[PDB]
Amino acid sequence: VVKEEGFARGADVSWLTQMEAEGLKFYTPDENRQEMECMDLLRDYCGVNSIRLRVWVNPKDGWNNMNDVIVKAKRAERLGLRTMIDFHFSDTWADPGHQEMPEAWKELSFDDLKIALSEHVKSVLTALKAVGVTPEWVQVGNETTPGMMLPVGSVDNPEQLTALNNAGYDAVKAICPDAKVIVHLDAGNDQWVYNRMFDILQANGGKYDMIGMSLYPYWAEQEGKTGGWLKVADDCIANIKHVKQKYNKPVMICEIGMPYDQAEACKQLITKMMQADVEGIFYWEPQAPNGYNDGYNLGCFDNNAPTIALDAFK
Numbered sequence: 001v002v003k004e005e006g007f008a009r010g011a012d013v014s015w016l017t018q019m020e021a022e023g024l025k026f027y028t029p030d031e032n033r034q035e036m037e038c039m040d041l042l043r044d045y046c047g048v049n050s051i052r053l054r055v056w057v058n059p060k061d062g063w064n065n066m067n068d069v070i071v072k073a074k075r076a077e078r079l080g081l082r083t084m085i086d087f088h089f090s091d092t093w094a095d096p097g098h099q100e101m102p103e104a105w106k107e108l109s110f111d112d113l114k115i116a117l118s119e120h121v122k123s124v125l126t127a128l129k130a131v132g133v134t135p136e137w138v139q140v141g142n143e144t145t146p147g148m149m150l151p152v153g154s155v156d157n158p159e160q161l162t163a164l165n166n167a168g169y170d171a172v173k174a175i176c177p178d179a180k181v182i183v184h185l186d187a188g189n190d191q192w193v194y195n196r197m198f199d200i201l202q203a204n205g206g207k208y209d210m211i212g213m214s215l216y217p218y219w220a221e222q223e224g225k226t227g228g229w230l231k232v233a234d235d236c237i238a239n240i241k242h243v244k245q246k247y248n249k250p251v252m253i254c255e256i257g258m259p260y261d262q263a264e265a266c267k268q269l270i271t272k273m274m275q276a277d278v279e280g281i282f283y284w285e286p287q288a289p290n291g292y293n294d295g296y297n298l299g300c301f302d303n304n305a306p307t308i309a310l311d312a313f314k
Contacts, residue, residue: 001080003049008082008136008280009313010050011042012255015285015292017072018063026287027305038287039079046306047313051076052084052254052282054142057102057120058091066124073133084282085128086139086184086254087121087168089149094142096186101149110160113152114167121171129175138179139254140168143186143214145193155200162204169207184212184254189235194243202247211243212254214284215273216298218262229258233269237276244277251277255284257298263307266300270312286310 016038026041028034042048053072056064069085076083088094091102105116121140128135147154153161169181183201187193194211201208217232225231240251253273258266273281285292286306288299300309 001043003080003082007274008050008084008252008282009047010052010084010280010282011046011048011286012052012054012086012282012284013038013042013072013287014052014054014064015288017068018061019287024287024289025304026301027303029306033305039075039081041306042286042310043079043081046286046310048081048310050082050084050136050280050282052086052284054086054088055124056088056091058104060091064088066127069124070127070131070133073128073135074131077133083133083135084137084139084182084254085124085135086142087124088142089117089120089140089164089168094144094148096143096145099141099144099146099148099150099153101152105149110152110163113149114163117149117164118167118171121168122175125172125175125179134176135179137182137210137252138172138176139182139184139212140165140172140208142184143255144183145185145187145197155196158200158204162201162206165201166205166207180209180250181207182210182212182252182254183208184214184252186214188213188215188239188253189217189232191239191242194239195246198243198247208249210279211247211249211251213239213251214255215253215269216255216257217269218258218265218298229265229269233272236273240276240278250279252279253281256281257284258300258309259297260290260299260302260307263300263302263309266307266309267312270309274312283310
């Protein structure tokens with residue numbers, strides 16, 4: 001198998017090694033319902049050509065640490081899948097409500113924090129290089145809508161945020177000169193979010209190659225928002241056009257997701273978004289059973305097998 005070029009039809013499968021340890025099995029979605037390794041299944045049955053993996057610095061249970069990422073990255077590479085590495089710059093989940101720097105970094109001067117962040121990114125990419133994996137894209141942060149490593153990298157501290165960002169960018173470029181560096185926010189439907197962040201970076205010499213978005217639009221149906229999930233998607237399409245024109249940077253949809261039992265709608269969402277001016281789309285943890293971890297329900301598998309959602313990718 002060889003890696004594809006062009007549009008990235010992606011899956012984030014960071015949980016996969018934990019799931020495997022927990023004894024989860026996955027199956028082909030056809031008349032045979034044959035047990036299969038999950039990445040191979042996504043490649044051969046769901047038209048996936050790309051894998052995204054989150055990185056945590058000093059995680060409690062080891063999962064998403066450098067060592068874990070290497071195992072999953074090597075597996076993707078073996079299967080001829082392109083890789084995105086997503087640095088959270090945290091020991092746990094980094095999202096718009098929680099951008100907590102690693103415990104071990106909290107006593108560091110600002111200059112030493114930048115060095116710690118730089119060294120972590122270089123450590124992880126160097127190891128990858130060593131084992132024959134060159135990622136195509138790297139995120140400096142994950143859904144950093146308010147900034148990162150709050151409050152040090154808050155948008156309210158735009159010089160510090162930009163310097164931490166740039167420490168990330170430079171680190172990626174050091175090891176992987178061709179890797180596209182992504183700044184990734186949530187709420188791809190919200191232009192203001194993007195304007196705030198990217199005007200900040202512009203005003204401060206912030207470096208990045210690509211704008212990343214999350215698109216999880218189902219809340220708009222559930223909450224009875226006029227226009228439903230479809231208006232959220234169209235607002236995201238408009239945002240994509242907006243940020244391309246304003247910043248002249250390409251866009252990736254780094255996370256997409258709908259409820260696992262909204263298989264048809266989710267198929268239409270992906271089909272619709274695949275014509276937008278984006279370089280790819282990554283389904284977030286497609287393989288996660290309904291109820292996983294805290295009650296997570298935005299996978300696109302049922303009975304341990306893909307629904308029709310990723311038929312959009314085939």
